[PDB]
Write a protein that binds this ligand. Structure first.
Ligand SMILES: CCc1nn(CC)c(C2CCN(C[C@H]3CN(CC4(C(=O)O)CCCC4)C[C@@H]3c3cccc(F)c3)CC2)c1CC
Ligand SMILES: CCc1nn(CC)c(C2CCN(C[C@H]3CN(CC4(C(=O)O)CCCC4)C[C@@H]3c3cccc(F)c3)CC2)c1CC
Ligand SMILES: CCc1nn(CC)c(C2CCN(C[C@H]3CN(CC4(C(=O)O)CCCC4)C[C@@H]3c3cccc(F)c3)CC2)c1CC
Ligand SMILES: [Mn+2]
Ligand SMILES: [Mn+2]
Ligand SMILES: [Mn+2]
Ligand SMILES: [Mn+2]
Ligand SMILES: [Mn+2]
Ligand SMILES: [Mn+2]
Lengths: 317, 317, 317
């Protein structure tokens, strides 16, 4: 089954954001029994392991932008693993780690199937450039490096030598937005990027959001799709354990309809479950809750449906 | 009126599942003044009573199915009293208890009104047969015994000799589904049954779920509606005190929107308020919350409109 | 932008209801940083201070209606300040306080912009007369005092000597209602008032709720809109520290979309955030959650979008 054949790349990286603990994301997500869960849900799973990041001493900030040589090397080494997975014939699955690893994820994937479309589930567009960036964090700057349109506006940041924009503006849709920087709104609006903030979902409902999202992305031909889900795109009552929570976002049901719908397209070929920090929870249940939501979102992507699932065998005999 | 004339049945029985305290559902709902409140909403109310359940010594299982004679005679006791209430020109209001009681509830109702239409608001389909069951719980098997299409596909289980199936596959709608077993999903597809799982609610909104449902059950002509309401159909953040709770489901608002709509037709003729377990509270407020949600649902079945209610008199006089 | 020039008036008035603490509403709304967050949002924020509401001891009640002289005095004082703000080209931002002050705000707004249409976002209709009312609390009687059609159904009550009904029973739309008295529902129907109870918000989504609200009042002409908002309209899970909390109301995201589509018109002239009682939250966090949501409600009515908000400059320079 193509839609059930997966390559599990675990990326324990955190130098893209200023809070420790997001590196233990792969670990906690694996302890919840996702490998076995996907295997009990008729899946062809194979684990590639955690990618190691041999510490980079001497990594002075590029202006205000912190940890550039580390953010880059981790994405360039992951980009090699995603390409190596896609060649083995499997849907790449990147467990983060911080969302700056999306540069590597989309990059390696795009090396095999350059015609990819991107659905981005996040509260923040994460579309900042090292010049527009207000915080300096590279986890909120992945999208600027990947757009063919922003070249010339993207400066020479140490560690990003390898980067060649692989996605054009027309090939990425936003869902769940509610925390956008002024500079990010300029990029969103002036580039003409198909966005659906929380206002959009409140007006149409996730049904019409996915109706327009899969038509906008797959209108002409059925090309492969890369889903870059940052768990802060959901409401902090479902994913409380995360670096940047913003209240009033996607509900548990909403997160399941997005993933259940993209599965039915039969074109999911890359997935990212980013920004899961297990040591950023106010109580143990906020941690369990977060991982249970991130694991449920994952199973919805690879076959799980709420109406039920059955095999081609007679159950009434 | 024929919509506010009620026959209050109590059903203190829990032997349909492995978690005790659900036999204390008819007690607690009555403590929270369910009857006092209905008479205020201008309801002609009668109390038939909380049914006494004959204690079967040594209830040997039928294969992996636990307590078959107890469920078999408790539902047979209900059927006789449901037929009585329905024949006394009254709308049955069963207070459970577990869902295995829907055998006698629907059977009793179809003796007076054989053209009955069933709306099942519940997280589970409960359509397992005594062979396709895996949990062995009889609260997950009613719809199978009740269905005519499964004749020959149900074995001789002790206590169900009196059982004459009375519903057709096209005489039932599902609303809330999210925890389905392969065998249960299989029968739903191979029997052409109309199901609205959480995916369908997330897609179409509770307005179109209630739109599609009523135009479907009352197609060619007007007929009587039997709403079997399990409080787990709603999210366990509104109904925690329940046996098999599943996260991210029907809201306290959607559950009300469904019930308000069946009242507006004036054809609700059979009601089941199932799976209320006050012994499954984790703070006395979660029982108080589950029981408040149960009374809000029922009051809405008899005209408790959220837009307002008034007597047919001049109020500016 | 004229939908950015603001005038702040803070009513520490609480004698319109039994629960004490609603008088500290504008002070807690000032510590949170209302003016500061608006100035960032590019607003012309000029404070008009706090109103000096004198004590009226021995204020005898009129029938079941308590503190009538004090309420009429408070709104008469507010009608004159709201008028000065309206005459200076500023949006009247009134910070309550209880919902009785909506007599003074809407009258003060009708003295300058008399062709205004109202949107009552509440959990209750607030349309009780000094006779029909069952509580005798004036924070639930403002609308009927302002209706021209109910000229003759309001008796001579001490303090409201100045009152002349300014709005018609057609220049108003209700939203989020789920606790409407029999007398309140009688007025709503035998007057034909546009309403969006919680039943319609569940039926048509908040998107079609706003197309139907905004068309019903802004069809023929681009007329001034006054939003008399009560935090009890939003579910007690979002604004819990309020006097009359009603479960199953508007969410954070529905209350944000409402205020977002109202800014988009550019016809907002008045705004009233009412009933934030900081002494009515079980935990200190419940107080914070009621206030943060009120701030989020206000800021959305003056430009704050979820998609982003940039200035008219080139972010790539
Ligand atoms: C509930 C609603 C709400 N309540 N509040 C707080 C009262 C907000 C605010 C939450 C925070 N944003 C500021 C941060 C939003 N940006 C996001 C990111 C980036 O581009 O760097 C970082 C995460 C990924 C993308 C970075 C920026 C920042 C952060 C640190 C330093 C700095 F100079 C600027 C302001 C609004 C909201 C959302 C409207
Ligand atoms: C992400 C949410 C989630 N997390 N998990 C846990 C990883 C679940 C699971 C919850 C349970 N279902 C299966 C049980 C639910 N079935 C239904 C019922 C029946 O007919 O017996 C029982 C309730 C009424 C109808 C019986 C079955 C069962 C139960 C016990 C033993 C047995 F062998 C089979 C598996 C998934 C979910 C819901 C999707
Ligand atoms: C689902 C939760 C629920 N559980 N219950 C209890 C079974 C209710 C009821 C709660 C109370 N309402 C009536 C009160 C609501 N009114 C409106 C207001 C007013 O006029 O003062 C309140 C604030 C502004 C508008 C005044 C009235 C009142 C109040 C005091 C005394 C008196 F005699 C009547 C009936 C339903 C609900 C709401 C469905
Ligand atoms: Mn992100
Ligand atoms: Mn994010
Ligand atoms: Mn059930
Ligand atoms: Mn169930
Ligand atoms: Mn009010
Ligand atoms: Mn109110």
């Amino acid at each position: 089954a193509k839609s059930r054949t997966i390559g599990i790349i675990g990326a324990p990286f955190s130098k893209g954001q200023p809070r420790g603990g997001v590196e233990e994301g792969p670990t906690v997500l694996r302890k919840a029994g996702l490998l076995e869960k996907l295997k009990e849900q008729e899946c062809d799973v194979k684990d590639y392991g955690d990618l190691p990041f041999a510490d980079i001493p001497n990594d002075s900030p590029f202006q205000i932008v912190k940890n550039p040589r580390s953010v880059g090397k981790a994405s360039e080494q992951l980009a090699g693993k995603v390409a190596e997975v896609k060649k083995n014939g499997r849907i790449s699955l990147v467990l983060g780690g911080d969302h700056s690893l999306a540069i590597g994820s989309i990059s390696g994937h795009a090396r095999v199937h350059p015609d990819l479309g991107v659905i981005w589930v996040d509260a923040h567009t994460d579309i900042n450039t090292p010049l527009t960036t207000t915080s300096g964090n590279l986890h909120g700057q992945p999208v600027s490096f990947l757009l063919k349109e922003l070249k010339g506006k993207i400066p020479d940041v140490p560690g990003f030598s390898w980067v060649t924009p692989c996605i054009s503006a027309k090939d990425i849709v936003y869902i769940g937005l509610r925390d956008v920087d002024p500079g990010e709104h300029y990029i969103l609006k002036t580039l003409g990027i198909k966005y659906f903030s929380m206002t959009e979902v409140d007006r149409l409902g996730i049904g019409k959001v996915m109706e327009e999202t899969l038509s906008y992305l797959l209108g002409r031909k059925k090309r492969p799709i890369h889903l870059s889900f940052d768990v802060d795109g959901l409401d902090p009552s479902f994913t409380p354990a995360t670096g940047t929570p913003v209240v009033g976002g996607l509900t548990y049901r909403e997160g399941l309809y997005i993933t259940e719908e993209i599965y039915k397209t039969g074109l999911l070929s890359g997935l990212d479950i980013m920004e899961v920090n297990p040591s950023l929870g106010k109580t143990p249940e906020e941690v369990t809750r977060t991982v249970n939501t991130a694991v449920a979102i994952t199973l919805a992507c690879f076959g799980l449906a709420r109406e039920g699932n059955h095999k081609p065998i007679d159950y009434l005999n």
